Ligand binder design. Structure first.
Ligand SMILES: Nc1ncnc2c1ncn2[C@@H]1O[C@H](COP(=O)(O)OP(=O)(O)O)[C@@H](O)[C@H]1O
Ligand SMILES: Nc1ncnc2c1ncn2[C@@H]1O[C@H](COP(=O)(O)OP(=O)(O)O)[C@@H](O)[C@H]1O
Ligand SMILES: Nc1ncnc2c1ncn2[C@@H]1O[C@H](COP(=O)(O)OP(=O)(O)O)[C@@H](O)[C@H]1O
Ligand SMILES: Nc1ncnc2c1ncn2[C@@H]1O[C@H](COP(=O)(O)OP(=O)(O)O)[C@@H](O)[C@H]1O
Lengths: 313, 574, 200
């Protein structure tokens, strides 16, 4: 009826629940603490040992830019529901105007758009079990958090129409960017969160998670992850892509930076792999029925490699 | 059976001749309706769903299951009748007529005992003979539905359930929701493979498996206002209609589906033609017809559009996101205008938004509209509506420095996820647009200065979300000579409309270039030089009737050696 | 035709005597309209455009094409009737009269089968007669429009499409948009050369 997975735990489901850290790390390379906390929350919810009044979980993800904060929420939604559109993504970048908070709950009676109702409330009512992600919460004013103070503590939200919406079964994930070697970064982020947000709002959340920076090993694994997308894209055109280990190491070499996140690696793959591959595809250098073995020429693998060339066969 | 035929239609007898389309992949939802209809009291299911997910298809599949014999004993040999409330209301001038018709219908159902009733658009039940506060269809059906003597299957949209049914909490009580969710891509492919025979027979065409895979994938990916499997079936049906029109055995492949999608949405999803391929490989030159110099920026935009047109673009991100940062007059707006001219043929298709108007915190609501309960809520946003008009467009943000940070923080979601939500609640997709941000900031040393200024005036999130940051370089003498040539060419093109031709010697162009160079150039100066020394003197002469229409004018120079400053040189219009 | 004449106007018979202006350069839009009208399910096109760009002009050109017989075999010898929704709701004074007239019109269309409806201001279907005890024309037409047993061509402004039809997604599903854009300068000159004979 309600779509809430309250059943007897089958053996396959139980084994998948014990292994959810591995299944989340299938997509999220690194970020062990956040995956751990999300795993404990979901196991607590599915064990039946959960406080009925409070929601299933309430986290705030903080740290540098491009370290999987939205990716972890998307991966959690992909685990729970099987596809990423089931994630209720409501973004606080649209709420710089204090007047826009009505979009969360609705217009009061006697005003235009009263019959339609809110955006968050109706989407939560349609799917009582969902992962609700508030992106970039630092950007909205402190008024919008006052509407969420009730759902963080008692799991109820009153819309304009007067009906009560239950947030008891939803996982609420905030993603902020305050603050931006690990321990001082964690302390700075926690102090920034204390300064920016009221303590009465930071007490109602289950966990404050600081995302660690990306280093060489997780960036060289992300090389594999984000070239898998291009490989799957080429599989639709009767084409296959393979990288030599030199290609993987060179892509990881030009895409690693600690003062930024994971996006320069995507730019390196877009400019060094996808652009020349697109040029070769349109010039019919390689087409359907052929594989592309991308290699590195004029390089040794140890130096920085300012002059290595990507070769396509 | 003599009463229910007038006010309804027999769905089981419709499935007797196979007039109902086959229903594929709805085993769970049909079984849910079966196991709700088998209750003791209040055995009424309502198929709550989205427009075009197969809510009526579930009922037709149940009718096909009934006529086949797969059903259990409680639903065996049960005729399924869809009720036309408009046929009940019609012709009832007197209250006795309408209520007596409805009670004859109920009496026939209760007498025969083997009619399941189907109400498509159940929200028409709340007020049929009168308002919600009097005797109508709902007020007569409620006592029967509550005690469970009448088996009624409602069908209702999610929004119509929220709006009309949910206000009447009595009918909400008497119907259990059965969510008919949106089928996935593989489910849509299986559904399309189910409906090959009917469309092949009607269209007299042949449809391939790759055609249906492409139809489902493209309908899921590109169309963003409808729900599967309706849009994939729309593409298949319209391609079949195209083939039937074109012949008077056909073959429908992925190319016809892509062409139908291109007609529908304007997104150029096509198998690339030879002429268009040779255009795209050399389109740096076709850009360089207008834009002069700036090889890095032209090359970057060329790579982005080439990646987009060859199917190597990330489906969750826009086609490209660019920061054209540099000094004024270099051509930051001109490259975007030339790109719009290349992509669409006209410069008015460039969705241009000036950020000078967004210089105060209140104007951020212009882009995505007003929240509910405020003025301007119905009209919606200015940018979201413009992009919803055409999914494939070049969106320019002019003089990006003038705006305040709230617009940037609103457009971060556009830059990364390729989506924008208006105050109306709709989601508009920017995944097919080319987003350009022009900036005049920081003015190899220019690269560092511009990068540092953009670091200072922006948050790291906005600079991470941007694909390419291109610092436009200053103009040089050769390309400003080419600039002068281009301005003279356009002035001559304007002049041919008045039956006149214009030409300059090399000396006049060289003098214009010598009087038009400094580190602030472009057309902000040296178009004033054309406006002062060429255009204005020509206007004075034509208005004086000298060198009038019909005579070619040759602009020469006097009192100049061709090397000196030329401050004493005079333009002569022979 | 005894009942549909009282509520609509024939455009094929109008093009028989040439009371419709010639249509120049709209071969693509007319081809797209004949494309959508040739489908099996959801064969209802809606001409979406700016006010004054020729929405009714496209349909008049379609009627001229039908009477000239250059249309395909699926649209050969089919009468294009515009439906005057004001005249449908005109003499009712009651509650069951409008639904009776609409049902009778649909019965005549189904028993003839060679009639294509045309609705100026398609957005007027929602609330096309809505009393305390009445069901509007949209809910009557939707079961026929969904399966494809009724072929209707709508004409709608972009603002009217956004404000009204987009607010009713069930009705918006049944209609395939056909975007009639503003003609270019050369297209306008061609249209002017076409209409020059009539204006002289
Ligand atoms: N640990 C990770 N594993 C896989 N991908 C990652 C990881 N961290 C970041 N990414 C990449 O970063 C992008 C998401 O970054 P995001 O979490 O949205 O950063 P922010 O929230 O600061 O904008 C995704 O495209 C993803 O590919
Ligand atoms: N399982 C299925 N098998 C075959 N066709 C389907 C299936 N589901 C949906 N369709 C097609 O999609 C359309 C569904 O329309 P429907 O969702 O009933 O409209 P509404 O939402 O207005 O009730 C029908 O035309 C039907 O042909
Ligand atoms: N490289 C170029 N190619 C063609 N026209 C140019 C070029 N550079 C400048 N222009 C001229 O400059 C004008 C646009 O300058 P623009 O770059 O928009 O100024 P700003 O840098 O202040 O935005 C146009 O009218 C165009 O004629
Ligand atoms: N292709 C064409 N040939 C001739 N006239 C045209 C053409 N397109 C538009 N028109 C003119 O446009 C007008 C039709 O505008 P119309 O679309 O009916 O307005 P609205 O959209 O407000 O209903 C007519 O006067 C007609 O003369």
């Amino acid at each position: 009826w309600t779509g809430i997975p309250v059943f007897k735990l089958t053996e396959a489901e139980t084994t998948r629940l014990l292994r959810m850290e591995e299944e989340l790390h299938k997509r999220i390379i690194g970020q062990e603490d956040a995956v751990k906390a999300v795993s404990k929350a979901i196991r607590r919810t599915r064990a039946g040992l959960k406080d009925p009044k409070r929601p299933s979980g309430s986290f705030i993800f903080a740290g540098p830019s491009g370290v999987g904060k939205t990716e972890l929420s998307k991966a959690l939604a992909n685990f729970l529901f099987g596809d990423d559109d089931a994630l209720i993504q409501i973004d606080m970048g649209e709420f710089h105007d204090r007047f826009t908070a009505s979009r969360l709950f609705g217009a009061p009676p006697g005003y235009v758009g009263y019959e339609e109702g809110g955006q968050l409330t109706e989407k939560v009512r349609r799917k009582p079990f969902s992962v609700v992600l508030f992106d970039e919460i630092e950007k909205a004013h402190q008024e919008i958090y006052n509407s969420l103070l009730q759902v963080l503590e008692d799991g109820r939200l009153t819309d304009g129409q007067g009906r009560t919406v239950d947030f008891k079964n939803t996982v609420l994930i905030f993603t902020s960017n305050l603050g931006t070697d690990y321990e001082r970064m964690k302390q700075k982020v926690n102090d920034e969160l204390k300064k920016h947000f009221r303590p009465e709002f930071l007490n109602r959340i289950d966990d404050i998670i600081v995302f660690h920076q990306l280093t060489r090993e997780e960036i060289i694994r992300m090389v594999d992850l984000m070239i898998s997308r291009v490989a799957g894209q080429l599989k639709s055109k009767d084409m296959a892509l393979v990288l030599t280990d030199a290609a993987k190491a060179l892509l990881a070499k030009r895409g690693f930076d600690p003062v930024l996140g994971a996006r320069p690696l995507r730019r390196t793959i877009q400019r060094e792999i996808e652009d020349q591959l697109s040029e070769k595809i349109l010039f019919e250098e390689v087409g359907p029925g052929q594989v592309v073995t991308v290699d590195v020429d004029n390089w040794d693998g140890e130096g920085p490699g300012e002059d290595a060339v990507f070769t396509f066969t | 059976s003599l009463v229910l035929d007038q006010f309804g239609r027999n769905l089981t007898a419709a499935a007797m001749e196979g007039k109902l389309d086959p229903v594929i992949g709805r085993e769970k939802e049909i079984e849910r309706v079966m196991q709700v209809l088998s209750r003791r009291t209040k055995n009424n299911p309502v198929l709550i769903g989205e427009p075009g997910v197969g809510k009526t298809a579930v009922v037709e599949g149940l009718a096909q299951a009934i006529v086949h014999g797969e059903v259990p004993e409680t639903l065996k040999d049960k005729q399924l009748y869809t009720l036309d409330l408009g046929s009940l209301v019609a012709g009832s001038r007197y209250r006795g007529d309408f209520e007596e018709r409805l009670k004859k219908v109920l009496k026939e159902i209760n007498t025969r005992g083997d009619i399941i009733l189907f109400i498509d658009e159940l929200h028409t039940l709340v007020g049929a003979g009168a308002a919600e506060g009097a005797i109508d269809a709902a007020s007569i059906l409620k006592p029967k539905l509550a005690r469970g003597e009448l088996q009624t299957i409602g069908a209702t949209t999610l929004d119509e359930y929220r709006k009309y049914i949910e206000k009447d909490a009595a009918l909400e009580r008497r119907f259990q929701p059965v969510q008919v969710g949106e089928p996935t891509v593989e489910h849509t492919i299986e559904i399309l493979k189910g409906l090959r025979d009917r469309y092949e027979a009607h269209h007299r065409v042949s449809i391939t498996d790759a055609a249906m895979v492409a139809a489902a994938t493209l309908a899921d990916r590109y169309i963003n206002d409808r729900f599967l499997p309706d849009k994939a079936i729309d593409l298949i049906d319209e391609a079949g209609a195209r083939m039937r029109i074109r012949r008077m055995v056909a073959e429908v492949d992925d190319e016809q589906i892509a062409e139908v999608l291109g007609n529908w949405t304007g997104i150029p999803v096509f198998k690339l033609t030879e002429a268009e391929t040779t255009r795209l490989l050399r389109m740096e030159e076709e850009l360089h017809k207008r834009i002069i110099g700036q090889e890095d920026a032209v090359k970057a935009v060329s790579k982005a559009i080439r990646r987009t047109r060859a199917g190597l673009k990330d489906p969750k991100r826009p086609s490209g996101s660019f920061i054209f940062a540099g000094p004024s007059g270099v051509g930051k707006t001109e490259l975007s205008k030339a790109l719009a001219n290349f992509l669409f043929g006209d410069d008015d298709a460039l969705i241009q938004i000036d950020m000078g108007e967004f210089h105060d915190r209140f104007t951020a609501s212009r882009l995505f509209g007003a929240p509910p309960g405020y003025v301007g809520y119905e009209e919606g946003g200015q940018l979201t509506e413009k992009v919803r008009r055409k999914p494939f467009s070049v969106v320019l943000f002019d003089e990006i420095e003038k705006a305040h940070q709230e617009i940037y923080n609103s457009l971060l979601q556009v830059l990364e996820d390729g989506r924008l939500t208006d105050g109306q609640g709709r989601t508009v997709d920017f995944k097919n647009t080319v987003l350009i941000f022009t900036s005049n900031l920081g003015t190899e040393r220019m690269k560092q200065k511009v990068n540092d200024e953009l670091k200072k005036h922006f948050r790291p999130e906005f600079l991470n979300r941007i694909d390419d940051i291109i610092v436009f370089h200053q103009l040089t003498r050769e390309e400003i000579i080419r600039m002068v040539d281009l301005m003279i060419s356009r002035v001559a093109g304007q002049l041919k409309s008045k039956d006149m031709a214009l030409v300059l010697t090399d000396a006049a162009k060289a003098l214009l270039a010598k009087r038009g160079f400094d580190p602030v150039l472009g057309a902000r100066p040296l178009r004033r030089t054309i406006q002062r020394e060429i255009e204005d003197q020509l206007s004075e002469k034509i208005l004086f009737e000298e060198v009038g229409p019909g005579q070619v004018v040759t602009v020469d120079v006097d009192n100049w050696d061709g090397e000196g400053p030329g401050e004493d040189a005079v333009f002569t219009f022979t």
